[PDB]
Ligand SMILES: CC(C)C[C@H](N)C(=O)OP(=O)(O)OC[C@H]1O[C@@H](n2cnc3c(N)ncnc32)[C@H](O)[C@@H]1O
C-alpha cells in the first residue's frame with residue numbers, strides 16, 4: 117500500500133474496476149430484490165455544476181447503500197434534451213440545436229463518469245432521439261382517437277415584429293421582450309391533454325403517497341384546486357332584460373363555495389365578456405371603456421392577486437332566489453370568463469375580497485354568520501369573518517343557527533326545490549396545452565387533410581422524424597418554412613396534405629422517461645411488459661422543488677394514462693420523493709460598456725481578504741483588474757456562479773467533491789459553496805487513508821474480530837460498542853432518515869474513539885481490523901473510490917459481496933452493576949442490576965432482596981433512597 121492518498125490515480129482505477137465487474141449494469145433479475153433509484157435527468161445545456169452534482173450524489177449514496185444490502189439496483193441516467201436552451205444557442209452561435217445538444221451530452225457524460233456514480237449507462241436515453249420520442253408520438257395518437265387529446269382554439273401571445281409566438285414570461289408590460297411591440301392576443305388551434313378528466317384521480321391518489329413530503333402533496337392539491345360549491349341562479353329582473361337572449365335573459369348563474377352566506381349577498385359581479393356586461397354597455401360608453409380595459413390585461417393569477425380590484429355598476433338587477441332581494445350587477449376585473457359561470461355573488465361581510473371591494477364603492481355588508489361572541493364591525497375586516505369551521509348562521513330565516521355544512525345541505529335542498537340551484541364540484545385545473553410554436557421539440561403526429569380533417573399518423577409510420585439539419589433564427593418556427601417536412605400525403609385518403617408543424621411541450625418527454633429506462637431499447641412499445649412488471653414503480657425519486665407541481669403532476673398523469681392503456685400496472689410512478697436543497701454560491705460581475713453587467717465565474721476570479729476577513733481584493737484572473745463581489749445566490753448559469761465539478765475533481769478528486777456535498781448540510785437544507793468545506797473534506801480523506809496505512813504498516817491485515825467478546829478488555833469492548841452503535845446509526849441515517857451528513861459525523865466519532873484506543877495487542881488488532889473494515893464499507897456510498905481501494909488493502913473478498921456491515925447486538929450490552937441494599941442505612945444485601953436499570957428497577961430489585969426483606973420486619977417503606985450505581989436505602 118502506498119503511503120499517501122492520490123485520488124488522481126486511485127479514482128480512475130476504481131471506476132475501471134466497477135465498470136469491468138458490470139455491477140451497475142442490471143437486468144430484470146428475479147433472484148434479487150429490485151430497487152429503482154432515480155434522479156431527475158438534466159437538460160444538456162452545456163456543463164453540469166456542483167448543484168447538479170449534489171443531486172446526483174444523493175441518489176448515488178442511496179443506490180450504493182441499497183447495492184451493499186444485496187438489492188438489484190437500477191440507477192439510470194439520461195438527457196432531457198428538447199427545449200429552448202438549444203434554440204437560443206442556435207440563434208447565438210449559428211449552430212444546429214441537435215449538434216449543440218449532442219456536444220453538450222458528450223461533455224456532461226464525462227463529467228458524470230469522473231464522479232463515479234453507480235449508473236447503468238446501458239440504459240442511457242436522449243429524449244431528442246427518434247427511438248425515444250416515437251413512443252410519446254405513439255401515445256399521442258392513441259389518446260387523440262379516444263378524445264383524451266383534442267384540438268381546439270386557444271389564446272397565444274403574438275409578436276408582430278419578431279413574427280413569432282411568445283411565452284407569457286416574455287411579454288413585459290403588454291409588449292414583447294426583444295421587440296417592445298404591443299402583443300396581440302391571437303386565437304389559434306392547438307392540442308390539449310384532457311387532464312381535467314383525471315382531476316379527481318390525480319387529487320385523491322395523493323393520499324396513497326405516505327412517503328412524499330406533505331408540502332409537495334399540498335402544492336399539488338392547491339394546483340388541482342378542487343372545490344365543493346353551489347350553482348346558484350338569480351332571476352333577471354323584468355326591467356333589466358333588454359338586449360339579453362336565451363338563458364341570460366332569464367337568470368344570472370354563479371358559482372359559490374359559500375352558499376351558507378347566500379342570504380348575505382348584497383351585489384353580484386360579472387366578467388367583462390359576460391352577456392350581461394355586453395348588454396348593459398350597449399348605450400354606456402363608460403362600461404365599454406371599462407370592458408376594454410379588462411380584456412387588455414393579464415388574466416395570469418400572478419398579476420391578479422396583486423391586481424387592484426375595480427368595478428362599475430350596470431344598472432341591471434337580479435333577484436336572490438332565497439330572500440327575494442333585488443341585487444345590482446357590477447362588471448368587475450377580478451371575475452374571469454371561462455372559470456365557472458363567469459359571474460359571482462358578493463358577500464362583503466364574510467369574504468375579504470368582497471369586503472375591500474365594497475369598502476371602495478360603499479356597497480352594503482350584511483352579516484349572516486356569527487362566530488360565537490366576537491364583535492362584527494361592518495367597517496373592519498377580521499380573520500374570523502370568513503371562518504367556515506366555527507361559525508353559525510344569523511339573519512337567514514329558517515337557516516338560523518346552522519353550521520356551515522348543515523346550511524350548505526339545507527340551501528342545496530331549498531335551491532333544488534325551487535329549481536334555482538344545485539351542488540356542483542369545480543376545479544381550478546385547466547386542460548394541458550401541448551402545442552409549442554418552436555422547432556427543437558417532438559413533432560406532433562397529426563396530418564392536416566382538407567377532406568379528412570386532422571388525421572393521426574398511423575403507428576407503422578411513427579416516428580414523424582424531426583429534421584436535425586436546421587438552424588433556427590427566431591423569425592418563426594423553421595418547420596413551417598420547410599415544405600420537404602410539412603408536405604406529405606393523407607394517411608386516410610392518400611391526397612396531398614400538410615404535417616402539423618408545432619411541436620410538443622417538452623414536459624412530455626419527462627412525463628414518462630422513468631418507464632423508458634426499464635427497457636430503453638424496446639422497439640414494440642413505450643415499455644416492455646416484462647420490464648414494467650419487474651421494476652414496478654420508482655422506489656426513490658430525487659429532484660428540486662421547482663418541479664414539484666407541473667412535472668410531478670404530468671408524470672403522475674402519464675402513469676395513469678399508460679396504466680389505462682395496459683402498458684403498466686402501477687397507479688403512481690414515485691414511491692418516495694426527496695427534494696434536495698439548493699447549492700448556493702457567491703456571485704461576481706463587471707459593468708458592461710453596453711449598459712448591463714457581465715457575470716464572471718468564481719473559478720476565474722481571485723479574492724484576497726484582510727486578516728479580519730475584510731474583502732480588500734477581487735481581481736479577474738485574466739487581466740488582474742478588480743471585479744464586483746455581489747450576493748450569494750442559487751448556483752446556475754444565469755449569474756454564471758456554477759462551480760464546474762471537473763475543476764474541483766482536478767484539484768481535489770471526486771471523493772472530496774462528493775464528501776463535501778454530503779457532509780456540509782442535511783440534504784434538504786441549502787448548501788453554501790465553501791473553499792474551506794472542500795479543504796475540510798479532503799483532509800478527512802487523508803486522515804482515513806493515513807489510518808488504514810498506519811494500521812497495516814504495524815503488522816498487516818488479520819482476521820476481523822467476530823463472535824463472543826467475553827474476555828476482551830474494557831477498552832476494546834467499548835470500541836466494539838462504539839463500532840456497532842455506529843453501524844446501527846449509519847444504517848438508519850441512510851435508510852430511514854436519509855440524513856447523510858450525520859452518518860458521516862457518526863463514522864468520524866468512531867474513528868475518534870479508535871484513535872484513542874490501544875489496538876496493538878493480538879485481540880486489539882482483530883478489533884482494529886473489524887472497525888476499519890466496517891468504516892470503509894459504511895462510507896463507501898459517500899466516497900466509494902477511496903473506500904474501494906482501502907478495502908482491498910484490508911481484505912481480499914469483493915467489497916460488494918461482503919455486503920453492508922451487520923450490527924452485533926452482543927457488542928451493545930454493557931456490564932452489570934452490583935448495588936448495595938440497605939435497610940435504614942445498614943447494609944443488608946446486594947443486588948446485580950443492568951447498567952440500563954432505571955431507579956424504579958433498583959427499587960424493585962432492592963425490595964425483593966433476601967437480606968432486605970428479613971430486616972424489614974414486615975414494615976412498609978417510608979422512603980426509598982436510590983443512588984444509581986452505588987446503593988439503595990429502604991427506610
Ligand atoms: C424531470 C425534468 C423535468 C428535470 C429537468 N430536466 C431539470 O430540472 O433539469 P436541470 O438540469 O435544471 O436540473 C437537474 C436537477 O438538478 C437540480 N439542481 C439544479 N441546480 C441546482 C442547485 N443549484 N442546487 C441543487 N440542485 C440543483 C434540479 O433541482 C434538478 O433536480
Ligand SMILES: Nc1ncnc2c1ncn2[C@@H]1O[C@H](COP(=O)(O)OP(=O)(O)OP(=O)(O)O)[C@@H](O)[C@H]1O
Nearest residue numbers: 343371372373374450451452455456458459460461
Ligand atoms: N369566474 C370567477 N372569477 C373569480 N372568482 C370566482 C369565479 N367563480 C367563482 N369565484 C369565487 O371564488 C370563490 C371560491 O374560489 P374557488 O372556486 O377558487 O375556491 P377556493 O378558493 O378553494 O374556496 P375558499 O374561498 O373557500 O378557500 C367562490 O365563492 C366565488 O365567489
Ligand SMILES: [Mg+2]
Nearest residue numbers: 323324325326
Ligand atoms: Mg400504500
Ligand SMILES: [Zn+2]
Nearest residue numbers: 565568606609
Ligand atoms: Zn385525406
